[PDB]
Amino acid sequence: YDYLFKVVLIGDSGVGKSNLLSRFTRNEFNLESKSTIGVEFATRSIQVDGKTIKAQIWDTALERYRAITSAYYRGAVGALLVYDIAKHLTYENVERWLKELRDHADSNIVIMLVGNKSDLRHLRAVPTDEARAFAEKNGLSFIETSALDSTNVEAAFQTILTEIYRIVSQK
């Protein structure tokens, strides 16, 4: 592989971290779910500008495993802050997740504000425009995905990995 990226996943418990990480690497979605203990690891390769990139994606569970989750923030080239569309609490705590990420990650890390559970059309609690406006105001990437419907799941990782490649062009 030409490059070895290291991406992390942050978000409140139960927002689809494990299923987004699942649906990307392998097309498997489970409703019956086990909460991630410590960290979950999955890998996949992609080609950006013809250069084969390898991505080590970790689903960090951080204060619960502070000694371990901090070791995965160090050197992390990218991060995906995912929140639950049908739960407005997980969207209010996004700033808190950004704060912990900034405290332990590099400033150059690109963070994409992902709104999972877009299939729950009727239970929507967080507006799409409020999240897209919150992304531009904080310098993040807003894109609502559905790990159940498998929509935008492969197109959300490839809009942050292509971004992780385009920001390493300054060499």
């Binding site: 139960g14 489970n30 409703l31 019956e32 049908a86 729950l120 059309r121 239970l123 159940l148």
Partner: protein, 473 residues
């Protein structure tokens, strides 16, 4: 699991199955997924489970409740009747908690004219408590109901009617108080005007009247003749959508256990129709107003067997012959078929639900020959007996219709086994956080499922039906 999402995607996933997983799954992602599929079911299919949903929002953990709340709020905006029955059922089952808060919001955000009308009918029944005789109660009942016409027509409806409508006139004279009890029920007749959708059509026009007792005459008459006198003397009787309803207002008795029986009745009615078994039962709608008040859908052309035996001074078999016809006329053979089919139907309803307190005051008899069981107060937790008088109407023991009554019970029990889950969940969900006399000892649902005898073979069900009939004697 992949399989669960597949099943939910699979058509086999009906509204009954969504309820079971919502009540049993401890996975919030599954509860939230189902909470979104409620919007994709039919309006009519989900409403039949509204007492189960609102009882789950009140008594289950906040995950189950907050998954049901979006569909309820959406339905409360579409239908004001849905808003009414929600607030009534919310305050009925919570003795506090979240449901009170939801109920207040539903009341706060056009419901005042309807709530005023219902609050009046319950105030009338309570005021009749000081009058000792049943005729003194009727004297005040009729004059007080004559005052509701000052507020009619209005945005007021009766939820026990299957159609959308406005109440335009009440004929006070035909209303009757049942007995001399302190919490005595009373019957009322209401003239309504049917519409296509209640929440779109405006209040109907008002037409005044001018007495001389041409139509006020309240006498024992057939329902077809009771409507004629009412429609003739009414200022709205010339309209096409003029319909006459009948409601029993109980202001002091709890009808929540009567609502549970209505559902079990309507599900078994749905199960037998699906299994093409020609049983017959009559589910009458229940309007739960509060934890100790409500209304009863009054079935017309139906009178207590205790009253048929007293008025006619005959036996049951003698009455059908006089009312319908001889042994060889079509009229009697039809009424006998409706008697047998309805008996075998309610026999199973009694056995499955353990409906105690079974006398001829709680059994009715409609004009076609069917029977209707009422007062589902001692259920689950006096028993049903096919008395000597009932066996006679079927032509005796060795007769054909009694063997057909025997086989109808077997076919209907085979059918009820093929759909046991759809019935048990109606009772099982309502046990949650309830203080009703039906749920006691934690064996209420264990013994309810055991009575379906799922393990028995069809040969062993035959002998089981033989034994039940012998006991009923």
């Amino acid at each position: 699991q992949s399989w669960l999402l597949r099943l939910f995607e699979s058509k086999l996933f009906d509204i009954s199955m969504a309820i079971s997983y919502l009540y049993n799954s401890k996975e919030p992602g599954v509860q939230a997924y189902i909470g979104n599929r409620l919007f994709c079911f039919r309006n009519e299919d989900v409403d039949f489970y509204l007492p189960q949903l609102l009882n789950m929002y009140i008594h289950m953990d906040e995950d189950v409740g907050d998954a049901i709340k979006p569909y309820i709020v959406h339905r409360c905006r579409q239908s004001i009747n849905f808003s009414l029955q929600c607030a009534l059922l919310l305050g009925a089952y919570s003795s506090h908690s979240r449901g009170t808060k939801l109920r207040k919001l539903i009341l706060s955000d056009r419901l005042a004219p309807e709530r005023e009308f219902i609050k009046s009918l319950m105030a009338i029944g309570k005021r009749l408590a000081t009058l000792p005789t049943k005729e003194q109660k009727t004297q005040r009942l009729i004059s007080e109901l004559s005052l509701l016409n000052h507020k009619l027509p209005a945005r007021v409806w009766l939820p026990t009617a299957g159609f959308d409508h406005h109440v335009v006139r009440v004929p006070h004279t035909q209303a009757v108080v049942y007995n001399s009890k302190d919490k005595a029920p009373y019957l009322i007749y209401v003239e309504v005007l049917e519409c296509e959708n209640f929440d779109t059509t405006s209040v109907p026009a008002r037409i005044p009247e001018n007495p001389e007792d041409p139509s006020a005459v309240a006498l024992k008459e057939p329902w077809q003749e009771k409507v004629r006198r009412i429609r003739e003397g009414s200022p709205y009787g010339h309209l096409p959508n003029w319909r006459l309803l009948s409601v029993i207002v109980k202001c002091g008795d709890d009808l929540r256990q009567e609502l549970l029986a209505f559902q079990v009745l309507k599900q078994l009615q749905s199960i037998w129709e699906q299994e093409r078994v020609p049983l017959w039962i009559k589910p009458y709608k229940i309007l739960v107003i509060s934890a100790d008040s409500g209304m009863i859908e009054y079935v017309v052309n139906a009178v207590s067997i205790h009253q048929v035996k007293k008025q006619s001074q005959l036996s049951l078999l003698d009455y059908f012959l006089q009312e319908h016809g001889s042994y060889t006329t079509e009229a009697f053979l039809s009424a006998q078929r409706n008697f047998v089919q309805s008996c075998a139907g309610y026999c199973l309803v009694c056995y499955l639900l353990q409906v105690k307190d079974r006398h001829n005051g709680n059994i009715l008899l409609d004009a076609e020959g069917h029977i209707i069981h009422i007062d589902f107060g001692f259920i689950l937790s006096s028993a049903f007996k096919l008395t000597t008088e009932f066996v006679d109407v079927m032509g005796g023991l060795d007769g054909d219709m009694f063997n057909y009554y025997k086989m109808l019970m077997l076919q209907g029990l085979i059918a009820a086994r093929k759909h046991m889950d759809k019935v048990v969940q109606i009772v099982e969900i309502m046990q949650q956080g309830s203080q009703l006399p039906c749920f006691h000892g934690s064996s209420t649902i264990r013994n309810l499922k055991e009575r379906f005898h799922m393990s028995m073979t069809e040969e062993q069900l035959q002998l089981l039906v033989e034994q039940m009939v012998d006991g009923s004697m």
